[PDB]
Amino acid sequence: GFRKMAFPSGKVEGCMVQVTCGTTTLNGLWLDDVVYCPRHVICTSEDMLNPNYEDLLIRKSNHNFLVQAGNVQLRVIGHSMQNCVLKLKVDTANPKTPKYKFVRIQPGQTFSVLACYNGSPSGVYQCAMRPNFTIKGSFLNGSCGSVGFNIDYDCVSFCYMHHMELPTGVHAGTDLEGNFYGPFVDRQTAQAAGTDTTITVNVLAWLYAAVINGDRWFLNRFTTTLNDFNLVAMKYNYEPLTQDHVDILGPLSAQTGIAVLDMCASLKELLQNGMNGRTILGSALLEDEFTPFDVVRQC
Amino acid sequence: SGFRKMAFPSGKVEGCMVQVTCGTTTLNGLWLDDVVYCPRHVICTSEDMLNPNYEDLLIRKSNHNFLVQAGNVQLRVIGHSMQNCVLKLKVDTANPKTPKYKFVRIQPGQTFSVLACYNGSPSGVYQCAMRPNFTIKGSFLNGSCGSVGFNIDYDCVSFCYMHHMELPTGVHAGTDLEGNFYGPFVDRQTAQAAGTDTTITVNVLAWLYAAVINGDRWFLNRFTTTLNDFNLVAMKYNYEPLTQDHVDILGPLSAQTGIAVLDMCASLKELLQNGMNGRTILGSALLEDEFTPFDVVRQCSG
Numbered sequence: 001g002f003r004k005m006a007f008p009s010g011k012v013e014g015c016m017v018q019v020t021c022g023t024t025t026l027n028g029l030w031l032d033d034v035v036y037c038p039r040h041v042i043c044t045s046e047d048m049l050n051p052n053y054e055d056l057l058i059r060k061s062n063h064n065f066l067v068q069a070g071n072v073q074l075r076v077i078g079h080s081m082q083n084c085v086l087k088l089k090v091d092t093a094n095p096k097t098p099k100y101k102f103v104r105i106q107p108g109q110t111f112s113v114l115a116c117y118n119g120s121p122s123g124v125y126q127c128a129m130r131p132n133f134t135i136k137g138s139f140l141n142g143s144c145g146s147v148g149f150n151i152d153y154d155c156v157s158f159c160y161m162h163h164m165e166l167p168t169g170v171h172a173g174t175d176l177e178g179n180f181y182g183p184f185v186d187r188q189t190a191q192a193a194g195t196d197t198t199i200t201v202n203v204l205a206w207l208y209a210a211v212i213n214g215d216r217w218f219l220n221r222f223t224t225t226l227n228d229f230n231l232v233a234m235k236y237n238y239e240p241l242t243q244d245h246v247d248i249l250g251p252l253s254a255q256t257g258i259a260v261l262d263m264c265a266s267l268k269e270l271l272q273n274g275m276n277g278r279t280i281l282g283s284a285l286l287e288d289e290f291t292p293f294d295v296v297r298q299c
Numbered sequence: 300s301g302f303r304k305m306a307f308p309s310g311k312v313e314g315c316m317v318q319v320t321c322g323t324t325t326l327n328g329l330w331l332d333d334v335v336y337c338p339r340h341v342i343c344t345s346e347d348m349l350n351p352n353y354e355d356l357l358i359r360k361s362n363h364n365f366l367v368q369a370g371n372v373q374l375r376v377i378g379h380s381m382q383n384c385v386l387k388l389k390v391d392t393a394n395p396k397t398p399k400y401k402f403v404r405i406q407p408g409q410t411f412s413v414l415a416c417y418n419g420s421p422s423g424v425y426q427c428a429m430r431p432n433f434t435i436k437g438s439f440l441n442g443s444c445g446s447v448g449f450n451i452d453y454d455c456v457s458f459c460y461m462h463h464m465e466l467p468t469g470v471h472a473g474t475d476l477e478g479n480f481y482g483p484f485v486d487r488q489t490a491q492a493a494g495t496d497t498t499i500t501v502n503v504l505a506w507l508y509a510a511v512i513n514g515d516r517w518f519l520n521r522f523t524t525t526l527n528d529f530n531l532v533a534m535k536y537n538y539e540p541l542t543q544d545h546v547d548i549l550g551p552l553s554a555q556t557g558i559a560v561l562d563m564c565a566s567l568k569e570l571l572q573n574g575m576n577g578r579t580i581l582g583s584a585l586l587e588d589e590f591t592p593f594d595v596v597r598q599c600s601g
């Protein structure tokens with residue numbers, strides 16, 4: 001079978017804490033003796049529209065920050081700001097700290113989101129970084145500071161911290177250095193993203209997944225050149241396919257014995273003609289949030 | 300749509316996963332207090348798979364034949380018993396990571412999170428719905444048996460599924476944590492067919508309530524129906540009939556929207572009888588049936 005699968009979240013759950021400043025409560029990430037969280041926690045409703053964060057932060061004391069790990073308050077013994085992330089130093093180190101790194105992911109890559117409220121893990125799901133640097137998440141009030149991550153071996157790579165929702169219902173946030181993905185800003189304003197495109201290499205990986213699991217009504221005898229496929233892809237607001245993408249798809253091509261450019265010809269036919277009421281792996285739409293790696297590992 | 304399949308955080312279950320080996324056969328087990336629970340077919344050879352005599356296979360087993368490991372650390376087995384299709388292995392250490400837990404038997408239509416594991420190591424977590432024909436659409440490879448499905452309420456893990464097998468159609472079958480299969484299946488390496496599947500009506504209704512909550516309500520009509528009339532129509536479209544429990548679990552969403560359950564049933568009946576006519580609901584022309592009423596409230600209101 002084939003399913004959208006998140007990484008097991010236990011290593012991250014052990015790091016989630018609650019951070020409160022004033023009447024604002026959200027989540028923080030407690031690694032070693034530092035708690036990371038969105039800096040907009042220091043805002044009031046009057047500050048959010050055009051917050052001078054350096055100004056607002058110098059006017060704060062360590063004791064204006066309440067950090068709770070379950071039933072226990074942690075003492076904040078220092079604070080700093082790195083871009084849009086506030087760093088709170090605490091006197092206790094987290095024994096549950098996993099091996100970890102901070103990474104900045106590329107558009108098209110996927111990661112798992114651990115959605116939390118009041119420092120408590122609530123759900124886990126898989127997201128992709130959209131080409132327009134939004135994510136199609138499920139985040140409600142109080143979810144800020146929830147993080148996204150991947151796990152390689154025993155190492156957790158943190159790639160996302162959650163900051164906001166856009167009026168279209170998609171979401172925006174930063175890496176763990178506090179730099180936004182995309183042209184967004186942590187102020188209380190209605191922000192639009194650039195035109196989104198579909199992640200072509202992922203659609204192809206998903207089509208290969210559908211074949212593996214015995215679904216192949218969409219295949220065809222035709223083939224296409226890389227450039228001719230890319231011309232059609234761009235017309236339909238699909239990302240262009242690179243030779244590295246073709247290479248990355250090799251394993252799935254070998255496994256099924258379907259040349260990448262043959263699958264490209266099937267996708268071209270789908271873009272031009274549609275699905276005709278049919279479905280692929282249950283979906284009436286082409287899915288683009290599975291990477292080739294995601295498909296390989298699970299098949 | 301604004302919805303996605305969301306699993307429960309898996310950490311409380313990760314802390315309970317172990318591996319159980321007989322000979323060269325390794326599957327996963329669930330370690331709670333001083334008991335490890337796993338599929339009984341761990342005691343099978345390749346040759347026992349066809350039609351195992353589990354009672355006879357077990358009588359030849361001793362505690363010292365079971366290798367239970369948390370990671371690479373052996374857990375000594377001090378007693379063993381069979382309960383339906385599950386083996387219970389008493390071990391000499393109480394799991395310090397045991398959460399508050401209970402064992403529950405879910406109904407078709409209900410959803411749960413699966414922590415897919417191999418050699419006692421978790422690989423991924425995803426949401427499943429129990430189909431009306433008592434299969435799930437999982438993603439399981441060899442060595443996945445003993446992976447469990449669960450829900451988490453407050454601090455309490457309700458274990459509802461343990462994985463045992465794949466069917467020729469590629470769907471999956473298993474037991475509750477008391478070893479009783481969901482559906483008519485048995486743990487033997489034979490060809491077994493699931494009954495024809497049907498659409499989970501209560502979840503489609505939940506989906507329609509979700510659409511209403513988000514302002515998408517063109518499909519609401521001025522009519523109502525009796526539960527019996529709706530069920531008889533529903534069955535002609537390969538939809539499951541509603542139970543009283545289904546009506547009850549739609550209560551919170553009916554109260555949130557002010558739309559009586561039976562009025563929503565009449566709206567669904569009209570969609571079934573007239574089709575969508577090129578319209579969409581929550582962005583789709585397909586009705587979703589794997590979000591329960593609880594799932595909807597989770598993602599709309601938190």
Ligand SMILES: *[C@H](O)[C@H](C[C@@H]1CCNC1=O)NC(=O)[C@H](CC(C)C)NC(=O)OC[C@H]1C[C@@H]1C1CCC(F)(F)CC1
Nearest residue numbers: 040139140141142143144163164165167186187189190
């Ligand atoms: C943090 O928990 C919070 C998460 C949001 C809340 C709802 N769903 C989420 O993912 N983030 C925020 O509250 C931020 C805070 C700013 C300082 C960045 N703000 C928003 O995410 O607001 C969403 C905008 C679409 C809403 C609206 C804002 C006011 C307006 F500008 F007048 C009109 C548009």
